[PDB]
């Protein structure tokens, strides 16, 4: 233990040149991959926008062509999963996480096309899912693909290129380089023992990917919130309160996502036909709801600015919350390819804004702006459900850019992570791999 | 066989640890704050004392020198006499403490480092408050471990980490950078640990609050909102990174080699040392008048450099002079970190690169200020080899998130070439040198 560390402190931060180059290509692929995926989802959402114009007079035929249009796409996605790669439903992050524990295989030859085209369908129909799921897993696999294609020996290479794939994947999903990197080191690392994940590699991966994303989808931000106001010290306690709320609600949400997977399993039994049909029913509901109420359906990256600015009434907020809790469960819990991250940012935004609303009229002394409580609460559901606060907090900070709110955000985050623990809750991405592994063995 | 242990009990820190974290941070906070006020106070005295002799010029250069000299000596002594393990930064010492290869003699170090650095920093030496606050912080974390008798490797390693964290935070008003420091660098990265990240947060939060209760409403670095970085411009940051990458190990040599050359001067003799100390400390307070830019923490020339208010000449000069004064202050065991002086070195070098780039590429519509900010944490990348920590540290202090891609690039570019030109994490090379004299 003694001479071991001595001198061997050299060979800290000594990543093999081969791995570093391979990370560069991994990122570059995950980049373009993510970009192409993202353009695809846009194009398809737009077709359905154009198709709703060929039927903009006949109102009941519109409600139809919206539903059926999202329905057909959902079904196509649900199918492409159930038929060719079952392990590519849901987010797929717990699958990538298992792959780091070598408890799950990375069937890239399958998942890549399945997740890509698969999600490209669920997201396309305007389902309440995030592009993270796809790009993080697609990313992770793209990392394994290049491992194989180049035959790279060692636990270092395998784990590193898999991580840096998952990283560049999350990065390209949010244009959030740091968030990507931090995702790995804070959370995505096999946190039961040490790893051979070279952080310098993750970097290069993330860099390349982020550039690839910026070569195309740039000059415009995913979330524009403008520079919100500051947060006076005598105001910080209000964020610890909001945190606690997220902390009690965090596990409650984690139950529903889990329990809902169960309840929805019955409806189809595991039957690839009842499933794909149940899928297109939800996917259809989404494209329909994405018209009659757009704020109840879709990624959620739209109501974020509109909520932060406080353009929603307290009523419309409470409604959007309930509706989105519902539509988020229906889309994620039901195996549809697509992450739960983005929907969680919206839910947190919306709830933070609601808290802000109330806080504003209870404390005119404090000179509050609900918009700061929105931004503090934005990554707060990610803290009490994913239990990855530092990741969400930097994710938010990279997207909303209001660093003056770092103290309040860190507090709401920690406040959420703490109460999520003490109320008896568990990292959602861990409780999901805990199940798919438990169900796997209990099936022997 | 039991192929399970599964997943629940991830992020399950014992309530006791979490509460103790809160207290650790609060202490490290106030401690940091008090330390900070002290250094200010003392710099101020020497500022006032330079007024009682503002007419007689040669008597001024004397009252500056001797003034910093006396304070330097006080600090160097407080170390060599009561706690030798509290010289230099003290980060390598806190790192060893996580590997259980160094002891945390808090009863000694706390007062030694506090008052010790309070002297070296006070005299206007080229050292950062991090050294003190990080170590002081780390020890404060162990003090409360003992005083409350906490069993387990978890509690020991956690409260020690969150102390060093809250310590770095309070030193820069950089909560994220604090947390990142542990997770990115400060974790014993040879195996897994029981460092509870949830605790580190609590510690850092409390500390940061404590810092903001007092030293707030004003920033350590104000740079304003710099311009943006067009994609066709990024290559210039990879170049700058490479430069920091080649220079990184070269600087790492000198810091190390200079510790050696300066050891001879005193032999290890606590009198020739304390005297040679007050010689440099005296040189500093003297230099901190005849040219303030070559002496002190460096948080002053940062804004003045980023704005490009220095000529190309005055930059190269400031660089050389600060390379010299930085080594003399750190390599010579004086209590006080090397982080801050590295930020200034990087700022200054980045600005110089920016200067050139600006007149080589009018097409790119450059502003040297962006290359300054990219370069700021670049020496921290090529020497400490902790780029994620430095990048977030700069980003938290300078607040130009639009420059994140360019910063990440310069950073990586430095970390890469530091490796390939054969260099090593300086805070590891120092713990390695200290453990290689314990065994060899």
């Amino acid at each position: 233990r003694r001479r071991q560390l001595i001198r061997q402190l050299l060979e800290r931060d000594k990543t093999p040149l081969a791995i570093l180059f391979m990370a560069a290509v991994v990122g570059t692929l995950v980049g373009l991959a993510a970009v192409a995926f993202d353009k695809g989802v846009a194009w398809l959402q737009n077709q359905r926008m154009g198709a709703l114009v060929h039927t903009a007079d006949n109102y009941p035929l519109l409600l139809t062509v919206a539903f059926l249009c999202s329905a057909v796409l959902a079904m196509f996605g649900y199918f492409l999963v159930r038929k060719y790669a079952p392990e590519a439903g849901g987010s797929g992050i717990p699958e990538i996480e298992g792959a780091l524990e070598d408890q799950r295989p990375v069937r890239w030859w399958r998942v890549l096309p399945v997740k890509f085209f698969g999600g490209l369908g669920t997201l396309g129909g305007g389902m309440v899912l995030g592009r993270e799921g796809p790009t993080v897993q697609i990313g992770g696999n793209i990392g394994r693909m290049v491992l194989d294609i180049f035959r790279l020996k060692g636990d270092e290479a395998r784990h590193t290129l898999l991580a840096t794939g998952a990283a560049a994947g999350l990065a390209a999903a949010f244009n959030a380089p740091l968030a990507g990197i931090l995702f790995i080191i804070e959370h995505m690392r096999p946190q039961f023992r040490y790893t051979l994940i070279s952080i310098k590699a993750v970097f290069i991966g993330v860099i390349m990917s982020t550039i690839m994303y910026r070569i195309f989808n740039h000059e415009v931000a995913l979330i524009d919130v403008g520079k919100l106001s500051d947060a006076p010290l005598n105001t910080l306690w209000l964020y610890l309160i909001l945190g606690i709320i997220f902390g009690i609600f965090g596990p409650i949400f984690n139950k529903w996502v889990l329990g809902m997977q169960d309840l929805l399993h019955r409806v189809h039994g595991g039957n690839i036909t009842k499933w794909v049909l149940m899928g297109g029913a939800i996917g259809g509901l989404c494209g329909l709801l994405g018209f009659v109420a757009p704020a109840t359906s879709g990624g959620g990256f739209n109501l974020i600015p509109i909520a932060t600015a406080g353009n929603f009434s307290m009523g419309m907020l409470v409604f959007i919350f309930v509706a989105r809790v519902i539509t988020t469960l229906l889309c994620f819990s039901s195996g549809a390819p697509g992450g739960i991250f983005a929907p969680m940012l919206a839910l947190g935004t919306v709830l933070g804004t609601a808290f802000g609303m109330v806080a504003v009229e209870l404390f005119p002394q404090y000179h509050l702006e609900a918009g700061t409580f929105a931004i503090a609460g934005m990554g707060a559901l990610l803290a009490a459900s994913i239990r990855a606060p530092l990741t969400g907090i930097i994710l938010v900070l990279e997207m909303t850019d209001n660093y003056q709110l770092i103290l309040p955000m860190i507090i709401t985050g920690l406040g959420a992570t703490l109460l999520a623990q003490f109320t008896g809750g568990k990292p959602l991405y861990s409780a999901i791999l805990a199940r798919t592994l438990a169900k796997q063995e209990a099936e022997q | 066989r039991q192929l399970i242990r599964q997943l629940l009990e991830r992020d399950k820190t014992p309530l006791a640890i979490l509460f103790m974290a809160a207290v650790v941070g609060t202490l490290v906070g106030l401690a940091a704050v008090a330390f900070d006020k002290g250094v200010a106070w003392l710099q101020n005295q020497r500022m006032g004392a330079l007024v009682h002799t503002a007419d007689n010029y040669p008597l001024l250069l004397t009252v500056a020198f001797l003034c910093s000299a006396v304070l330097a000596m006080f600090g160097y002594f407080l170390v060599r006499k009561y706690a030798p393990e509290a010289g230099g930064s003290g980060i390598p010492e806190i790192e060893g403490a996580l590997e259980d290869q160094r002891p945390v003699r808090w009863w000694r170090v706390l007062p030694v480092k506090f008052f010790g650095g309070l002297g070296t920093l006070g005299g206007g030496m080229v050292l950062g408050r991090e050294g003190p606050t990080v170590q002081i912080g780390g020890n404060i974390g162990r003090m409360v471990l003992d005083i409350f008798r906490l069993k387990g490797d978890e509690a020991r390693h956690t409260l020690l980490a969150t102390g060093a964290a809250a310590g770095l935070a309070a030193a820069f008003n950089a909560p994220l950078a604090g947390i990142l420091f542990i997770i990115e660098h400060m974790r014993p990265q040879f195996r897994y640990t029981l460092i509870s990240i949830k605790a580190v947060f609590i510690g850092v939060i409390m500390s940061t609050i404590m810092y903001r209760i007092f030293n707030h409403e004003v920033a350590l670095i104000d740079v304003g909102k710099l311009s943006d970085a067009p994609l066709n411009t990024l290559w210039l940051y990879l170049i700058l990174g490479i430069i920091f990458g080649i220079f990184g190990p070269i600087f790492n040599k000198w810091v190390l080699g200079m510790q050696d050359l300066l050891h001879r001067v005193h032999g290890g003799n606590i009198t020739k040392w304390v005297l040679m100390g007050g010689a440099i400390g005296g040189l500093c307070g003297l230099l901190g008048f005849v040219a303030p830019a070559t002496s002190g923490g460096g948080f002053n020339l940062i804004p003045i450099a980023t704005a490009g208010n220095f000529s190309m000449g005055m930059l190269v000069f400031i660089f050389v002079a600060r390379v010299i004064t930085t080594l003399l202050c750190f390599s010579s065991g004086a209590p006080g970190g090397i982080f801050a002086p590295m930020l200034a070195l990087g700022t200054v070098l980045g600005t110089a690169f920016g200067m050139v780039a600006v007149e080589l590429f009018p097409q790119y519509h450059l502003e040297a200020g962006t290359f300054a900010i990219a370069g700021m944490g670049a020496l921290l990348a090529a020497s400490i080899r902790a780029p994620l920590t430095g990048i977030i540290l700069v980003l938290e202090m300078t607040d130009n998130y639009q420059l994140i891609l360019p910063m990440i690039i310069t950073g990586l570019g430095a970390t890469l070439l530091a490796q390939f030109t054969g260099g090593k994490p300086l805070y590891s090379a120092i713990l390695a040198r200290t453990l290689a004299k314990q065994e060899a």
Partner: antibody
Amino acid sequence: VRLLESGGGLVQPGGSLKLSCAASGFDYSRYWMSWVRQAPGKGLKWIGEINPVSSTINYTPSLKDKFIISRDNAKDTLYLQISKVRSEDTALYYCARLYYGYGYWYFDVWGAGTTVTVSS
Amino acid sequence: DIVLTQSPAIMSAAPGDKVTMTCSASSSVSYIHWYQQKSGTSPKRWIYDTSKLTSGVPVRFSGSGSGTSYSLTINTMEAEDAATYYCQQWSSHPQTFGGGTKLEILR
């Protein structure tokens, strides 16, 4: 940093006026603005405030629509409208830039004033 | 609605005296602020959050107190120290000033 309020003077009871306050030496957006008046003899009394994005305007427990605080950030200027004037409204009127320390808000920088005499 | 009242309505003291006013509130106050007004000029921020000198305020002034009674204070009062001192809270809403204390050069 100079605040320059104008627009006060002689008004007949029951009339109206538009006190103006023009900002300079600082980013007039970013700040909460305020009106405080001092009735001769008497003491200091706060009328109201308005934030940068005009999304909040608070007045004193003054009765139903007496004052109308508004701001135009484009000209960097704060307005006060007093309608149905009285003897009571005869005072020196100050605009003030609002700030804080620990977050217990204070009246940061004031202007010279404008005097409003209300009489027949 | 919170009401603040200052102890000396008017008062006098000789250059280099220990001047000490008061601000007492009907209910609970936190971190009050002090404004100095000279005749024919805009009020100026003097002390804030119970007791913090503003950027130019000479070091002889000082605040203190809590809960229900605070105090401005002068060690070695000056000539230019004569004016009206208005305390003011915002601990509660709406905010409120005090009566004022006129400090005057006793000759």
